[PDB]
Design a protein around this ligand. Structure first.
Ligand code: FES
Ligand SMILES: [K+]
Ligand SMILES: [K+]
Ligand SMILES: [K+]
Ligand SMILES: [K+]
Ligand SMILES: [Mg+2]
Ligand SMILES: [Mg+2]
Ligand SMILES: [Mg+2]
Ligand SMILES: [Mg+2]
Ligand SMILES: [Mg+2]
Ligand SMILES: [Mg+2]
Ligand SMILES: [Mg+2]
Ligand SMILES: [Mg+2]
Ligand SMILES: [Mg+2]
Ligand SMILES: [Mg+2]
Ligand SMILES: [Mg+2]
Ligand SMILES: [Mg+2]
Ligand SMILES: [Mg+2]
Ligand SMILES: [Mg+2]
Ligand SMILES: [Mg+2]
Ligand SMILES: [Mg+2]
Ligand SMILES: [Mg+2]
Ligand SMILES: [Mg+2]
Ligand SMILES: [Mg+2]
Ligand SMILES: [Mg+2]
Ligand SMILES: [Mg+2]
Ligand SMILES: [Mg+2]
Ligand SMILES: [Mg+2]
Ligand SMILES: [Mg+2]
Ligand SMILES: [Mg+2]
Ligand SMILES: [Mg+2]
Ligand SMILES: [Mg+2]
Ligand SMILES: [Mg+2]
Ligand SMILES: [Mg+2]
Ligand SMILES: [Mg+2]
Ligand SMILES: [Mg+2]
Lengths: 167, 94, 94, 122
RNA sequence: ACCUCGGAGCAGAACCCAACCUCCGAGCAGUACAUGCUAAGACUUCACCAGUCAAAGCGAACACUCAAUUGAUCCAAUAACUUGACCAACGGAACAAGUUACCCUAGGGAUAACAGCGCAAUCCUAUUCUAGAGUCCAUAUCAACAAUAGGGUUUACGACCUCGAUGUUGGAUCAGGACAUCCCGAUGGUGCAGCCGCUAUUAAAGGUUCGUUUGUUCAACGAUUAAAGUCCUACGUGAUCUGAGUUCAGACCGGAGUAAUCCAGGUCGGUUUCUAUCUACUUUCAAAUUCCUCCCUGUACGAAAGGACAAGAGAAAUAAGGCCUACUUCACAAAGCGCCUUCCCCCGUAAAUGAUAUCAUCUCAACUUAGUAUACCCACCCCACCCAAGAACAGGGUU
RNA sequence: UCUCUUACUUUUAACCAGUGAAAUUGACCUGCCCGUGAAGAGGCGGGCAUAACACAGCAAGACGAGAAGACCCUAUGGAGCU
RNA sequence: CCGAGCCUGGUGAUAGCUGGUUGUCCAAGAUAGAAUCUUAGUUCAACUUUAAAUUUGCCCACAGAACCCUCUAAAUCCCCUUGUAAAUUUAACUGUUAGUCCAAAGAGGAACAGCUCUUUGGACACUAGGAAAAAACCUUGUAGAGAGAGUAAAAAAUUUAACACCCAUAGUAGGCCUAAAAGCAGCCACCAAUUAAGAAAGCGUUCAAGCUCAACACAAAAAAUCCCAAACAUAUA
RNA sequence: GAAAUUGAAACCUGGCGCAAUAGAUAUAGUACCGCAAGGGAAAGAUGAAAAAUUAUAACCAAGCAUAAUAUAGCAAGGACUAACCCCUAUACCUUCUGCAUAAUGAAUUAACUAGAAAUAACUUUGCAAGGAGAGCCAAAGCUAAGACCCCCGAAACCAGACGA
């Protein structure tokens, strides 16, 4: 047959033996690299968004004195915006920050005992003037919305403490 | 079942042949012997200039022996004793 | 069997090649008189001597041809010196 | 077309790692070869068959002694895949006239001049 | 068409190197008129024959250009010198064409047709790709440019086997096998309401009609059927048969040729041998398939028109295996047109529990569920007769 | 003739007795499957089967036997005819 | 056995065709071509044989062998050394040349054929071992006996597809063009409220509606008599 | 394919001829075949005595008989205690590149059946510038010997006869 064929032409046995002997042999390390302790990962530079949140978060704890910690339930957007409109009427803000950014801030800070509260979807109800009484009645519209707690005037209070403060 | 068209080891569709494990080892063993031959041929004792003319006398004398044997071809001598020794076929006792 | 191991011990791959098992005479007289050499042993002795004499001849011929090349190079060096001694420059140089 | 082979000169250039592997010394190359045919001249080109005859390698596994010179090396480089090349070593030196009958070429490539057929007392 | 000679490619670098090869040519002309006479040494178209170069010398002046441009011997002509053939079949016979199936002889599987075999251009099939048809919508179906593999059923190609007795085609007989399934069975999808359909997976146990013209294979249409499958097997089977078409001698029509004679056409007729030596085989001891009608049911479904599942019954047909009470051919019997009997699942998928992958998930995860054999045969007087037993032998009975 | 064959007689047939050929024949102690091979295997490779043995049938094989078959081609082989 | 009877004679007609070609042993011994009414033949050369003469033969170091031409090829020719022992000429004739397959380069066919045609090399018609059986692949040749030994080539591999969780309100049906085509008939621009969201990447609507995502959070196979050695993952090469 | 020219010996009674598939076909041109011309065989075997048949004893081809056969296979070889069982082994000739080939030929036994020529060269003798028993050759030749060249088969052609 021709030297070049459309099908794979069968090699001569001597040539085929030559090809088999001269096959690539990858180097084999004595110990597999996965089993050996991997070197520490290179340092990761902080994202500008993360360092922006820390400045914004620190302002919240300093500017406004009343901070209320609640669980941001999976309410409908229409009902979630409507309550925010009700909170905006009484000058109450609804700020939400990631836990992986907020936890390190509270790890080394005055508000260190608020760390266990932030587990899951959480939201912060803050206001310069502690209108606890006006806030509680807004949250009573939905029995399934839990009030975890808060810290008023650098004093950590539970849900019942807000109830007593409101009265 | 399993027919190979035409002859086995010739043609367009031949019976496939595979290299066994010892077949690879035999070829590697052959390569190692020849790889060592390349080493001993890389260290000549003398150069081309030094080697020249070092065996001219022996080669010249060797061919002269061939010429002597080639030019000495001749029929063997014929002795008169051998011709007379054929009469012994009729030797007998008295 | 065992050919590779024997070659690593400086022996022959075939035990029949050389050594006490083969080279020694296979028999001797009861009185103690040595036996005549065997035909195979005589053939090997002649073959080894011819190989030995070739080794001596080849080594001597290379040395003889190496000295001749060294002598010619020395002769060529001397010829340059002889031609320079002829006459002395004059004229501008003096 | 199939023809002869021109082996590049770089092939016959021993590296420093080869002198520590085969035990040779480039500064003091060996004087004589020990060539032994280990392959059949059958199924090989006619010019390889002729060179085998010129080197006296008719019978296989029959050691032959040749001189390490470029002209002889030129013939060896043609049939280098059919023969085994080993240097000839002389631990006792060149055989003399009195040692011709006591020579023996061992498999290691050394030619002894005293073949005693006697176990070493050491 | 071609046959001799030369150049270029193959043949890349000393030479050489082939076709059915890939391209172009040559069968001359012109200038000389020492394009005279001689002679060392060489080349050489793979032989020979021919062909090519050539110093010096003599004699004169002061080895012509051109790749090819050519034809031997004999013979004829000629005083002589010289000349003579698209001898082009160009190494050339001095001069000779067709036809033969009326043919003969010597051979050839070096060599054709049929066949076998090789090969897969063609043919055929499934995937890949997702453009495009399918009102919308690639993927119910269908499909372009292509890609990737398989198959050896057609048309071709190769000339390897057979030229010292297979003519081929078709039919009859009996068929064995493949599954790429025409029908019966099981199961997904559907542009699946139900009937019909389409498509895909699984399945080769069983079946696959009778006729008119035609040598028919095939095909046309005639009536049917659950269906009237695709193939292979020396395009199965011709020491089993047929000889209709083609094939030998006759003849005719049409055509070609001066004729002899010929024909891929039409028409008529035309010898088909064989006593089984060998292999193989000569009761697979016995499980059957299908349609129709009925019932469910005029039920589910549907707006109606229409119209089913599964299970059960009856009847009929074939297939297999028997029988003679009738019927019929016939008569101590055989036989069918007559009578009797006929018994298993089928594994494609549809679902639970439940990890890898703390949900879920039918699990080339452990696991669970649905469909995932029996019968027949079995001992050990014989001369002879008889026999529903039988070629012989054997077998049964003989009270 | 056929759907669709069947019965009977005669010849043949088979057995007993007598007489007694022919083509044929390399040697055979002469199996099946698959593969291989000068391309179609009783003889080769791998599996399977297998005491010996006659008689009667059968015609798938022994590219069965019988006339160097027919059929194309070859020969500086023939002949007839124009 | 009449496309030309039979018999005898010429006649042992001739046949480039078919078949056959008789004792033993040893030795050397294969593939360029040209011409041919020639390709079934013959002649010459090549090759081969014997005898004889003679001296170089083979291998091969540099040097050396074209330009128009970069397939800028593999490699030859020439060729002292050297390894070796043949070579040439003379004499006498026979015989072979209808070759195969493998590797490689290149042609024709279809980048098919156990296809055809050249070139280089090997094998075969020469033995043996190994590829299952085996002319052409591999190993290996010079010949006998042995109930010794060491080795050469020499035993096919391979089993392939899980996979996001949760969430989504809004300047608005962004304008143009369109019966209206709104993120999704097309198009110009592609900013922007909000912790965080495409003037929309796909589906579904005559157009809208509805939906997801992006965002915040958490790699196949099937033909015809009947599959085809039996098998075995684990005791040191 | 000559001639002129040259000129020869010459004793029948033999055989390095055959021995029944030989030598004439021959036991005979008979038997037999064909209308005719014509073709054309086959075979016999004792002994001095058959007027000794009490005879011419043994062994010898294929073919049989004596004495059918036991898994398996080119029929054999290596072997073995042992025939087989085990192992190994693709009949012969011829024609082709290549045949176990399912290509040719052969049932078998016996007999018969196929390489004839000396120009050159070579080898070995004789003699030698000569050789040879007229002729012929000769610049070492010449004379002599030895040693190389098959069998069967057509369809046809011609002549003379024989046949309606
Ligand atoms: S075996 Fe080392 S990381 Fe698992
Ligand atoms: K001609
Ligand atoms: K026949
Ligand atoms: K038969
Ligand atoms: K011829
Ligand atoms: Mg090729
Ligand atoms: Mg085959
Ligand atoms: Mg020439
Ligand atoms: Mg010619
Ligand atoms: Mg010519
Ligand atoms: Mg006619
Ligand atoms: Mg199927
Ligand atoms: Mg047929
Ligand atoms: Mg037929
Ligand atoms: Mg038949
Ligand atoms: Mg007819
Ligand atoms: Mg007719
Ligand atoms: Mg019946
Ligand atoms: Mg009888
Ligand atoms: Mg007979
Ligand atoms: Mg038998
Ligand atoms: Mg077979
Ligand atoms: Mg077999
Ligand atoms: Mg029988
Ligand atoms: Mg019959
Ligand atoms: Mg001719
Ligand atoms: Mg007649
Ligand atoms: Mg003849
Ligand atoms: Mg020989
Ligand atoms: Mg001619
Ligand atoms: Mg998302
Ligand atoms: Mg006679
Ligand atoms: Mg006998
Ligand atoms: Mg056996
Ligand atoms: Mg006449
Ligand atoms: Mg009359």
């Amino acid at each position: 047959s021709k030297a070049v064929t459309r099908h794979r032409r069968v090699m001569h046995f001597q040539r085929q033996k030559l090809m088999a002997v001269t096959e690539y042999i990858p180097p084999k390390p004595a110990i597999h690299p996965s089993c050996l302790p991997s070197p520490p990962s290179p340092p990761q530079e902080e994202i500008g968004l993360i360092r922006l949140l820390r400045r914004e978060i620190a302002a919240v704890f300093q500017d406004n004195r009343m901070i209320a910690v609640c669980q941001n339930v999976a309410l409908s957007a229409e009902d979630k915006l409507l309550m925010r409109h009700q909170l905006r009427k009484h000058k109450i803000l609804m700020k939400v920050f990631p836990n992986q950014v907020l936890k390190p801030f509270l790890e080394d800070s005055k508000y260190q005992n608020l760390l266990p509260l932030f587990v899951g979807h959480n939201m912060l109800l803050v206001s310069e003037e502690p209108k606890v009484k006006e806030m509680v009645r807004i949250l009573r519209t939905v029995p399934f919305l839990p009030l975890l707690g808060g810290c008023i005037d650098d004093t950590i209070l539970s849900r019942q403490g807000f109830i007593n403060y409101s009265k | 079942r399993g027919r190979i068209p035409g002859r086995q080891w010739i043609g367009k569709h031949r019976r496939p042949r595979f290299v066994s494990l010892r077949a690879k080892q035999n070829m590697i063993r052959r390569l190692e012997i020849e790889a060592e031959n390349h080493y001993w041929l890389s260290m000549p004792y003398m150069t081309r200039e030094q080697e020249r003319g070092h065996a001219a006398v022996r080669r010249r004398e060797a061919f002269e022996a061939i010429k002597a044997a080639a030019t000495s071809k001749f029929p063997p001598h014929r002795f008169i004793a051998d011709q007379l020794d054929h009469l012994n076929v009729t030797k007998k006792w008295s | 069997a065992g050919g590779q191991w024997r070659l690593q011990q400086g022996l022959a791959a075939n035990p029949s090649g050389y050594g006490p098992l083969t080279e020694l005479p296979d028999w001797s007289y009861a009185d103690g008189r040595p036996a005549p050499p065997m035909k195979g042993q005589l053939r090997r002795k002649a073959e080894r001597e011819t190989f030995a004499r070739r080794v001596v001849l080849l080594s001597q011929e290379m040395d003889a041809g190496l000295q001749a090349w060294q002598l010619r190079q020395q002769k060529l060096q001397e010829e340059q010196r002889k031609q320079e001694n002829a006459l002395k420059p004059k004229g501008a140089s003096l | 077309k199939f023809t002869r082979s021109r082996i590049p000169e770089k092939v016959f250039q021993a590296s420093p790692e080869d002198h520590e592997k085969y035990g040779g010394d480039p500064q003091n190359p060996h004087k004589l070869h020990i060539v032994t045919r280990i392959k059949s001249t059958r199924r090989r080109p006619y010019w390889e068959k002729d060179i085998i005859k010129m080197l006296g390698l008719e019978k296989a596994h029959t050691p032959q002694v040749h001189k390490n010179i470029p002209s002889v090396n030129a013939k060896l480089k043609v049939v280098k895949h059919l023969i085994r090349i080993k240097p000839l070593k002389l631990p006792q030196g060149l055989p003399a006239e009195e040692n011709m009958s006591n020579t023996c070429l061992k498999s290691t490539g050394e030619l002894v001049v005293q073949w005693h057929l006697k176990p070493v007392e050491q």
